[PDB]
Amino acid sequence: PKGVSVEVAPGRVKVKGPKGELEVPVSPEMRVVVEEGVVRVERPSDERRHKSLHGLTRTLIANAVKGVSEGYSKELLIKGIGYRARLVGRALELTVGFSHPVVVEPPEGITFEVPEPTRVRVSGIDKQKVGQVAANIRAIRKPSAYHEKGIYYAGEPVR
Amino acid sequence: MKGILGVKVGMTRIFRDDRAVPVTVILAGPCPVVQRRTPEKDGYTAVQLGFLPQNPKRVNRPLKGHFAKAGVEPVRILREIRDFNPEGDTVTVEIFKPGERVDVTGTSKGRGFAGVMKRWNFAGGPDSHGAHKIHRHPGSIGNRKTPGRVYKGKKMAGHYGAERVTVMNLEVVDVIPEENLLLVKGAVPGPNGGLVIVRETKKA
Amino acid sequence: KTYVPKQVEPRWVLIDAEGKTLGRLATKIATLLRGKHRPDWTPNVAMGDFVVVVNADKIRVTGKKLEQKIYTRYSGYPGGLKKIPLEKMLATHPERVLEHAVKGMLPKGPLGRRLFKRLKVYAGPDHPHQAQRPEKL
RNA sequence: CGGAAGGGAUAACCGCUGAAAGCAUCUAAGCGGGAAGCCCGCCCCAAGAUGAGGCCUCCCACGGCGUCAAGCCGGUAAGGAC
RNA sequence: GGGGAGGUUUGGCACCUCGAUGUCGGCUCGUCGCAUCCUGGGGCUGAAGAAGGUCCCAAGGGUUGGGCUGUUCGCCCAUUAA
RNA sequence: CCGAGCGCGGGAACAACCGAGACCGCCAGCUAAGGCCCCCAAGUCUGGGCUAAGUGGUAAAGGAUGUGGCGCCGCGAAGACAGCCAGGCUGGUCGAGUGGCGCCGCGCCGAAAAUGA
Ligand SMILES: [Mg+2]
Ligand SMILES: [Mg+2]
Ligand SMILES: [Mg+2]
Ligand SMILES: [Mg+2]
Ligand SMILES: [Mg+2]
Ligand SMILES: [Mg+2]
Ligand SMILES: [Mg+2]
Ligand SMILES: [Mg+2]
Ligand SMILES: [Mg+2]
Ligand SMILES: [Mg+2]
Ligand SMILES: [Mg+2]
Ligand SMILES: [Mg+2]
Ligand SMILES: [Mg+2]
Ligand SMILES: [Mg+2]
Ligand SMILES: [Mg+2]
Ligand SMILES: [Mg+2]
Ligand SMILES: [Mg+2]
Ligand SMILES: [Mg+2]
Ligand SMILES: [Mg+2]
Ligand SMILES: [Mg+2]
Ligand SMILES: [Mg+2]
Ligand SMILES: [Mg+2]
Ligand SMILES: [Mg+2]
Ligand SMILES: [Mg+2]
Ligand SMILES: [Mg+2]
Ligand SMILES: [Mg+2]
Ligand SMILES: [Mg+2]
Ligand SMILES: [Mg+2]
Ligand SMILES: [Mg+2]
Ligand SMILES: [Mg+2]
Ligand SMILES: [Mg+2]
Ligand SMILES: [Mg+2]
Ligand SMILES: [Mg+2]
Ligand SMILES: [Mg+2]
Ligand SMILES: [Mg+2]
Ligand SMILES: [Mg+2]
Ligand SMILES: [Mg+2]
Ligand SMILES: [Mg+2]
Ligand SMILES: [Mg+2]
Ligand SMILES: [Mg+2]
Ligand SMILES: [Mg+2]
Ligand SMILES: [Mg+2]
Ligand SMILES: [Mg+2]
Ligand SMILES: [Mg+2]
Ligand SMILES: [Mg+2]
Ligand SMILES: [Mg+2]
Ligand SMILES: [Mg+2]
Ligand SMILES: [Mg+2]
Ligand SMILES: [Mg+2]
Ligand SMILES: [Mg+2]
Ligand SMILES: [Mg+2]
Ligand SMILES: [Mg+2]
Ligand SMILES: [Mg+2]
Ligand SMILES: [Mg+2]
Ligand SMILES: [Mg+2]
Ligand SMILES: [Mg+2]
Ligand SMILES: [Mg+2]
Ligand SMILES: [Mg+2]
Ligand SMILES: [Mg+2]
Ligand SMILES: [Mg+2]
Ligand SMILES: [Mg+2]
Ligand SMILES: [Mg+2]
Ligand SMILES: [Mg+2]
Ligand SMILES: [Mg+2]
Ligand SMILES: [Mg+2]
Ligand SMILES: [Mg+2]
Ligand SMILES: [Mg+2]
Ligand SMILES: [Mg+2]
Ligand SMILES: [Mg+2]
Ligand SMILES: [Mg+2]
Ligand SMILES: [Mg+2]
Ligand SMILES: [Mg+2]
Ligand SMILES: [Mg+2]
Ligand SMILES: [Mg+2]
Ligand SMILES: [Mg+2]
Ligand SMILES: [Mg+2]
Ligand SMILES: [Mg+2]
């Protein structure tokens, strides 16, 4: 948690950093300790649901950190002939086998990048945001299970 | 949300560019605004439009003050037009450009106590093999001990027509401001003389 | 012969509703609605206090209720069984949810309806600033 | 000329972040997508909605009995009926 | 080979009704259930595409005309999104 | 037991289920079954567990890392299960438990019908 600026509140935690500040809804019955330059958290007991709540926030907070730190971004491959993508200012239009060129809106906090017609990174400050947006694209043209086409994260081929 | 009162004047057909077009002619004389109601004074937005001239003697009513409150020649009729605050003091056929599609409300013709066949376009009965008693009848109307009653809203004969009817998306054809006339795509509720309102449609 | 009461001035009351469990609240409201708390009680006459409630939307409700609870409006017509879940009530007119709870706990008779009038409900707060307002919990 | 468009919430289902259970999971906290269907939107009725709603305008004291109180008889106003 | 749901079939029992609860078909008028025939959504496919298979969600609406028979049903002609 | 107690209380309602065998009167008292949050008389009574399905508000074979409680077997600080590096169980790293079976309590699925619930 170096260089950060995590500031505790009643039911939430405001984490700041080079990238910026971001709110993270924290559970009620949890102790967000701010030991030293780092941060800890402890649970009121040792019940089934409490364990879940600890590990959840335990990570959910660590994301607030990394988020304002190094930031997040996911790649996107694009197979098939006509299948490609041209960045257009903020938004990106990509023809991928449809008679209508797909215009993709750029949500706030997110700024996807296009290094190549086939490759596409998705810059962002929030795992929740980035994760959705990434999928939001694969959704535009899932991987044809009969050969290579449509967009891919970077994972194995559907074959 | 344009709007304007008028009277169905009649209907005949004109020739567009080279094809015939059946059109109704409405007359939406100059309608003086009589009261603009805001969300402050009332709770909605709308305008009271007057219509035909009136014998000042016939309007001895308190309406005289309502007319004076806006300083306008006593009109014969006046209705509101929801969500529509214009300009000036009078609306005109100028509000409608040819090509714009409008909704026309009106009062359908009065058919009084009409039969079920007449009213709900029922089937009635056979003219030949059957009893000469149910030729134009509704036949059955229910079941047995269950429900043992008749469904509310069952279609039956009764007073019908002579009611508020709104036809929609009628395209406005040539509109003559020179005489306050307004042509439309023909079918429009009411008899030749009935007060009708003409609004903006919902195509999108 | 047991005591025979006489005309009594309506005692008004102001009630909160934030965090209050729907029913637990409705009970007391009902019991105060009829003069059943005052020892000069008489079923015959009906002289319950004018209860006024505020902050309706604030009402709590345990477990799956906003999603589970269903309200039935039957019209006289076929298939008119129209049913509405709790969440929708608070969206539209939320005051209803407390009303349809109190109304249910009042007696069925004619004076029971006369009692449902004594009950005033809003969510704001800000009642019609009349006169009485003896707060309570 | 109409069935819509459109907004909102969902079904099966697809998915993001994510513990419990170092991994993994659409879920346990949370969030997004998704039906000719649900809510609304259109059209008609509609304040006996006795919970009888709002606005604009017009007319407006008592002339005689009941000692407070509730009423009764007549000429009227705006206005209404025949 | 095993467990069940439904109460459309055939039937068991004899409980109201024998000082009367008119029977099959058709017509007219429908309305409801969903275990969905079509249209909408979706999973798997021995799913290349188109077409189709099975299962899931979903009543809003729709669900033709005729030959034969008293027929219900069924067969058949011509079509349909069905 | 009803019949003959369709007289009373309870059970929503209801001959025969639970309580009880009504000579008359009373603006007296103790109870019975059943109940004591409101409609509805009396505890939003006390203490100790369980249940998140409205289960409770009433369905089976059979299915499932539901939740809690009890007992046993295999590996483990001579480093185990899991993941990450390398080779094809072994090594390293980390570092405290982990995997399988059986029984009890409550619960989930299986669970589609016709006028409005
Ligand atoms: Mg994945
Ligand atoms: Mg007038
Ligand atoms: Mg209007
Ligand atoms: Mg005929
Ligand atoms: Mg005959
Ligand atoms: Mg005859
Ligand atoms: Mg009946
Ligand atoms: Mg004429
Ligand atoms: Mg407050
Ligand atoms: Mg129904
Ligand atoms: Mg239906
Ligand atoms: Mg008040
Ligand atoms: Mg005050
Ligand atoms: Mg899907
Ligand atoms: Mg898929
Ligand atoms: Mg993880
Ligand atoms: Mg995952
Ligand atoms: Mg959730
Ligand atoms: Mg699940
Ligand atoms: Mg959503
Ligand atoms: Mg949506
Ligand atoms: Mg939809
Ligand atoms: Mg609707
Ligand atoms: Mg009205
Ligand atoms: Mg009125
Ligand atoms: Mg009024
Ligand atoms: Mg005067
Ligand atoms: Mg005077
Ligand atoms: Mg005077
Ligand atoms: Mg005087
Ligand atoms: Mg006069
Ligand atoms: Mg069988
Ligand atoms: Mg049967
Ligand atoms: Mg039957
Ligand atoms: Mg039988
Ligand atoms: Mg016998
Ligand atoms: Mg008989
Ligand atoms: Mg008889
Ligand atoms: Mg008879
Ligand atoms: Mg018979
Ligand atoms: Mg036939
Ligand atoms: Mg189904
Ligand atoms: Mg089947
Ligand atoms: Mg289609
Ligand atoms: Mg697929
Ligand atoms: Mg399929
Ligand atoms: Mg296919
Ligand atoms: Mg295909
Ligand atoms: Mg049907
Ligand atoms: Mg319908
Ligand atoms: Mg046929
Ligand atoms: Mg024939
Ligand atoms: Mg024949
Ligand atoms: Mg046969
Ligand atoms: Mg043949
Ligand atoms: Mg044949
Ligand atoms: Mg054939
Ligand atoms: Mg053919
Ligand atoms: Mg005996
Ligand atoms: Mg005996
Ligand atoms: Mg009895
Ligand atoms: Mg009894
Ligand atoms: Mg008996
Ligand atoms: Mg008895
Ligand atoms: Mg006993
Ligand atoms: Mg005896
Ligand atoms: Mg005793
Ligand atoms: Mg109790
Ligand atoms: Mg307690
Ligand atoms: Mg069961
Ligand atoms: Mg079982
Ligand atoms: Mg299975
Ligand atoms: Mg199985
Ligand atoms: Mg628990
Ligand atoms: Mg168990
Ligand atoms: Mg090891
Ligand atoms: Mg089910």
Short mmCIF file of C-alpha atoms (C1' of nucleotides) in Angstrom, two decimals, chain C residues 70-85 88-89 92-93 96, chain D residues 38-41, chain E residues 33 60, chain F residues 115-117:
data_model
loop_
_atom_site.label_atom_id
_atom_site.label_comp_id
_atom_site.label_asym_id
_atom_site.label_seq_id
_atom_site.Cartn_x
_atom_site.Cartn_y
_atom_site.Cartn_z
CA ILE C 70 -47.24 -9.20 -3.05
CA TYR C 71 -50.34 -7.00 -2.93
CA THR C 72 -53.63 -8.05 -4.57
CA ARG C 73 -55.99 -5.62 -6.33
CA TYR C 74 -58.98 -7.48 -7.81
CA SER C 75 -61.20 -5.57 -10.26
CA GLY C 76 -64.64 -6.90 -11.18
CA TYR C 77 -63.43 -7.89 -14.63
CA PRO C 78 -61.88 -11.16 -15.89
CA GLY C 79 -58.17 -11.58 -15.14
CA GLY C 80 -58.32 -8.31 -13.22
CA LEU C 81 -56.32 -9.94 -10.42
CA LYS C 82 -53.59 -7.30 -10.88
CA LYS C 83 -50.86 -7.87 -8.28
CA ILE C 84 -48.10 -5.55 -7.08
CA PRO C 85 -44.88 -6.36 -5.15
CA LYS C 88 -43.44 -0.95 -6.41
CA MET C 89 -45.63 0.44 -3.62
CA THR C 92 -45.56 4.89 -6.37
CA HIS C 93 -47.51 5.90 -3.26
CA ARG C 96 -50.16 2.89 1.12
"C1'" C D 38 -44.65 -7.39 -16.16
"C1'" C D 39 -44.78 -1.75 -14.98
"C1'" C D 40 -45.30 2.66 -17.74
"C1'" G D 41 -46.10 5.00 -22.53
"C1'" G E 33 -55.37 -23.44 -17.30
"C1'" G E 60 -49.71 -10.91 -25.28
"C1'" U F 115 -63.70 -17.38 -11.93
"C1'" G F 116 -59.30 -13.67 -7.82
"C1'" A F 117 -55.76 -14.28 -4.53
#
